[PDB]
């Protein structure tokens, strides 16, 4: 994907993450835990559902048309009827092949994108309190109990609270 996050700097996915598409996995003094991120999961799902609804809209309704199968050779008119139908089918098969390929390239980039937005959101919450470990993880340079972890996950984490502790730990 264009962002290099999924199948990228994130080494792989979590078969255990069964209640969301994206999430946090933390390690702290009390142990470890995984939780889903709702916003990022919902953004992805919405866009995918959005494009799914767009594709179904039933707009093809045809009654009397032209014959498409023949019991005897006729020459000129039949050649035309056959050619017209074959032209149409080729053009619709083409439209379909290009639609999917392009409806897949984009979707995979969108999902890669959303993974990246989550990462970047967290990057910005933590300020100078953390460092990017290169693998989708931040090292957090201060004690961070379960409440503090959830404060990162729910977006109420105030970096000013731990800034002195964390900067001291990084710089020395």
């Amino acid at each position: 994907g264009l962002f290099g996050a999924i199948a990228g700097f994130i080494e792989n996915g979590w078969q255990g993450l069964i209640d969301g598409w994206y999430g946090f996995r933390h390690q702290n003094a009390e142990g470890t835990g995984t939780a889903a991120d709702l916003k990022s999961t919902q953004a992805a799902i919405d866009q995918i559902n959005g494009k799914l609804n767009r594709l179904i809209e039933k707009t093809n309704e045809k009654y009397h048309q032209i014959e498409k199968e023949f019991e005897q050779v006729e020459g000129r008119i039949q050649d035309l009827e056959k050619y017209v139908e074959d032209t149409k089918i080729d053009l619709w098969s083409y439209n379909a092949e290009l639609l999917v390929a392009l409806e897949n390239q984009h979707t995979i980039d969108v999902t890669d994108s959303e993974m990246n937005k989550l990462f970047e959101r967290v990057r910005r919450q933590l300020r100078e309190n953390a460092e990017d470990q290169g693998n989708g993880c931040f090292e957090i340079f201060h004690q961070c109990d379960n409440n503090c972890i959830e404060s990162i996950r729910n977006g109420t984490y105030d970096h000013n609270i731990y800034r002195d502790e964390a900067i001291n730990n990084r710089i020395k």
């Binding site: 792989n12 979590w14 009654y63 009397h64 897949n104 993974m115 989550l118 967290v122 931040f138 961070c144």
Partner: protein, 319 residues
Amino acid sequence: GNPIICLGHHAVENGTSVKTLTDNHVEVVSAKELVETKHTDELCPSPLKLVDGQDCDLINGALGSPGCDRLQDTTWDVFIERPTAVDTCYPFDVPDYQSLRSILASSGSLEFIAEQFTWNGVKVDGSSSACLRGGRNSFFSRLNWLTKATNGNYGPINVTKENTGSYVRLYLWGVHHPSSDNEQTDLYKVATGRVTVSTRSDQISIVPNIGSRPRVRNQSGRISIYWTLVNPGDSIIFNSIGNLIAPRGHYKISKSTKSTVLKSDKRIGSCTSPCLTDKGSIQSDKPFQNVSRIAIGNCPKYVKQGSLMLATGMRNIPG
């Protein structure tokens, strides 16, 4: 040892393969098939109104051939012609058969509007052993076989009908081509017949030809079927000194009116589907379909591919 927090995404054991602009095979977490490949095998009688020709095709149904009597006053969204349909009457041919078939199919109705005609100077209601109804001689129920008055002249025919109504009338009539000079005279007296059918703006004049054609139902003659439309306000005249196969009335043309004929062999079920093919019905929400180029109603568009997977999830990386 400092705390860490990792951002990740979900994955599954078994992904699904999709195509992209650059890759034929890319594994994603989920995908949905957009090409419909299955069908019901029976034709669904709802919501489209079906009429099953059974052993009559549509034209035989319109002419009134011996097997077609259940085909009277019928109406349809789709008329179904069967591969088992057979001819049962006097052998006939239709110039531009396909266009008469198309015009009927589209009007969506076999409800005949019967008219009284006064054919002066001929015998009427001719019949034939090549067209048997219940073992006895009979004839297209919508056509009138005229012959010379018994023992005298084929009193010249000049009958006219004025379209006084609000719809376009379609008249079915024919011309008898005898297998010999004897038959011609025995039937029409004159040595050469002539049938001219006309309205104010169009007209159709035929001279029958006498000769041998392969025996069909023991008959070596033929009847040629023609048709004439008549707008409101216009008039049609039937002028003939011989060999006129006469009409008993007319059909109502409605315009481009959402009908058609399907040539399938499948039994009419009790299922529901807004899309019929010659192969059965399609019950799908998919955009495209593999089943048949012949698709009537609200259908997925026919394509050549048997599969087009739309990705509906991120890349799947379990390992």
